Structure 1
Amino acid sequence: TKNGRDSNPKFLGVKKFGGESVIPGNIIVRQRGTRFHPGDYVGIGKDHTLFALKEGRVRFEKSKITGRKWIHVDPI
Structure 2
Amino acid sequence: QGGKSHAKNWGPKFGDGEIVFPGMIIMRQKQGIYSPGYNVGRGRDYTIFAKTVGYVEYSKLKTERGKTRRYIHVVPINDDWSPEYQKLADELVVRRAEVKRQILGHHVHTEPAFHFSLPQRNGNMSWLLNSVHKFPGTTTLA
TM over 0.5, shorter chain: yes
Deviation at 1:64, TM superposition (A): 3.8
- One-letter code of the match for 2:32? T
Greater Rg by CA = 2
| Residue correspondence of structure 1 range 33-48 to structure 2 within 5 A | 33-48=31-46
Larger deviation, residues 31-40 vs 5-14? 5-14
Structure with the bigger RCO (C-alpha within 8 Å, sep 6+) is 1
| Residue correspondence of structure 1 range 31-70 to structure 2 within 5 A | 31-65=29-63, 66-70=67-71
**Alpha-carbon RMSD:** 1.4
Partner SS state of residue 33, structure 1: coil
Partner SS state of residue 53, structure 2: coil
TM-score computed with the length of structure 1 as normaliser = 0.86
TM-score computed with the length of structure 2 as normaliser = 0.48
Deviation at 1:14, TM superposition (A): 0.7
More strand by percentage: 1
Larger deviation, residues 4-13 vs 36-45? 4-13
The partner residue of 1:28 within 26, 30, 44 is 26
